[PDB]
Point group: D2
Chain length 258, copies 4
């Protein structure tokens, strides 16, 4: 059954997070066949500017993600940045996310695999798809059983990303493949993304074949303290989920095996 | 009315051209809501090696095309390489094709636009999507009425191309878009990988395009150009049905330009 | 000796074409160690907009060139966009130039090789350094004797080119190499002139058989490639620099 | 005073390190106009394979680097991978190196700046040159006073890097610039090209930069990392000589940022 990873890019506030957690609960009720997982970063450890929003800290974040899980019965995924953050995070996160810039930091991957939780690894903007076989190999060595590789775009010149859809079938050979619909259309350092392309590339993803879609959402995308240009309006989620399910239905029959 | 441009990369032997030509005809008959067009090049004026198969001349070509156009009643399309080849070829081809490397050559375009026939420009591997607008403008200024833009991959480092599927909705702003499913999986001087041909076609119809461009051959390993990318004639039907199904569902979400 | 192809990007006029031929002449006299070659195009056959300047036809073209070739005694070179322009242009052009986008068009290559002239091929923005081998194999077959490969940048994402300086030694394995100092910094569909010089020093330091650069008396008033056109009054300086760097670096140029 | 950062990629063993340091010492004596800074990693924390050499631990690596500083009187530099590593490393490092994949990791940048030591950031392969400004601003925010940016290539298609030398003058506006002659010709996940190392250094000094970074090993074929890109310890002298020579004549043309 299809995996949908949704949430706010960052934990801007517990009030905002809970509101977003409500739409996902409602959505899981409407799409019984989809496996939903609530996502949110407790820290933007890689912002370009020292002036940008980062977060309220690990403690606060883990506590807020807990509220969402306890109040909505939703599984959780959040990203970690240094080794020591795995265990504490593993307390509430069902899936530990590894940032794209860190997909090669051996200790971080090992730390995460060691918690016993599932691990999703954002493919680096510098990584060739075949080069992800070693990422999985490390996680496996570290104890990881539920492994995920997430397509999030490849460096295409300066301040731009391209999604080479060949990566989906190649990566499926070693792990469940996920398509990150929001960061893939993001233009890095662009102000120091293009929301209109989010939906069309998602359809491409499911036509090609993947095991899940990752998409960030916000009640007021233009007021988002992070990834504003690319976060989707809460009201748009429903329509996109339906199209994924419909496109997957008629397409699955053609997904290449293995 | 989805447009499907299929055929042999080049005219190797009219016998094969007819074998592929009847197969198309059969399909055009099964899929009546589809408009087929027979594609094939009378010459390969852009091969890397000097020892590579080119063609049997514009004469033998234009002749072979009309032979298929009459024996099967299928619309024809082929590409021109120099300003002159326009007029002579517009006598058998309904769609004049402009090569990828020549998409910026003002006079070649200006010419094919005069023949009154429809024009299809392969987007250069060096062109950014939003740059195809000027290509359209040149042709309109030249009398082109039915204009087509074709996605065929972009230079992604050395000996490799990538398909930026954002180009489809972008070029759709000023022309009908075609997705080249065979040259896009091709590896420049590598090459190509037939294993990705179909998956990306699926991607193209899911995103939304006005048609696809494929190339088929009775048995690829025998092809004389782009052999590792040529699609086996048999599979051609399964694919056509596949993208029609996907198109039926996907079109409900195509953005409105 | 060292090659220095200079001149205007386009033949905006025979008047201006001369003001430039005069300066190239002077520099030609001040640096007897360098083989200068006047260059300009009679037709910008590949402009982006249909509304952009092209030239005054092959007529006024070869006309203006032949004039400089006799009034200043400088060798001349220009680019052809279709096979027929080969022999007719090979009347005044010592070096026939092949545009970047056309570098794989066999007939344009064979047609230039026929004329028995020197053929300089702009390496396409879509071509790998090593793929230029066949481009030289095509010219040999076509009767070419004096061949050149020009580095003019590689497609780097949308509307941008990067100069992979590894090509210089790679290509030098089968052809003399020229570096296009003005087009290698252009932004397809735009340009940054502040990088023209720096990259030239980089080209000679690595090692090349010659430099290719376009100049104009008043760049801001140019009708083609305004942004990437050295103001005539700077060519001399740059040329002194290329020689100096070439003298110190020569010693280190690898060996094919 | 031109800066030459040199040493062996990883601290393979203390003896092998002292051997390289002996040579670096010799060079600092012969080239008194150059400022040599010895470099070596106590840990390869980003190896593609779980089976590759990483190192003998921080403590071991800090002792070795200190033995090289003490015995040969050379300045030291090494890279850090997690915040906690900054402080202990600063006891010996004159310059704290920040890995390319980690160049956007704020807490690591801050941790290094807080030590009071100079900081040299490897420009990420996904970073445009103008994006480094925000990097230099994070460091100043953290207390860094002496800052360096190192050009080490940019992602060019898969398993390949290209060096855009327009990045030197661009980055010189915010920090002193070093050119990494070793990783720039490296082919990521390819298994580099040793023959291109010297040519690119020449281009680098010609264009203009405040220093060059080059790893060296006595027996490159037996290196436990970056084997294909480490220079034979016997070639360094030639390179440095040529560099000073090129810089000598080229220096006057460096454009005043």
């Amino acid at each position: 059954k299809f995996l949908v990873i949704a949430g706010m890019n960052a934990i801007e506030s517990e009030e905002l997070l809970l509101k977003v957690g409500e739409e996902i609960k409602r959505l899981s009720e409407k799409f019984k066949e989809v496996e939903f997982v609530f996502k949110s970063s407790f820290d933007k450890a890689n912002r370009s500017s020292i002036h940008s929003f980062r977060g309220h800290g690990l403690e606060y974040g883990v506590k807020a993600l807990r509220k969402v899980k306890e109040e909505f019965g939703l599984k959780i995924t959040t990203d970690i940045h240094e080794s020591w953050q795995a265990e504490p995070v593993a307390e509430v996160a069902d899936i530990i996310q590894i940032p794209a810039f860190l997909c090669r930091q051996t200790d971080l991957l090992l730390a995460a695999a060691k918690t016993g939780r599932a691990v999703n690894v954002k493919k680096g903007q510098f990584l060739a798809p075949w080069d992800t076989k070693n990422v999985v190999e490390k996680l496996k060595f570290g104890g990881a059983k539920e492994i995920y590789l997430t397509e999030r775009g490849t460096t295409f010149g300066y301040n731009n990303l391209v999604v080479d859809f060949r990566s989906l079938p190649i990566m499926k050979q070693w792990a469940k493949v996920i398509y990150d619909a929001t960061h893939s259309v993001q233009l890095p350092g662009g102000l120091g993304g293009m929301r209109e392309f989010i939906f069309p590339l998602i359809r491409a993803a499911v036509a090609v074949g993947c095991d899940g879609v990752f998409m960030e959402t916000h009640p007021e995308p233009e007021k988002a303290l992070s990834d504003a240009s690319t976060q989707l309006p809460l009201s748009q989620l429903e329509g996109i989920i339906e199209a994924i399910l419909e496109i997957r239905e008629v397409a699955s029959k053609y997904y290449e095996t293995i």
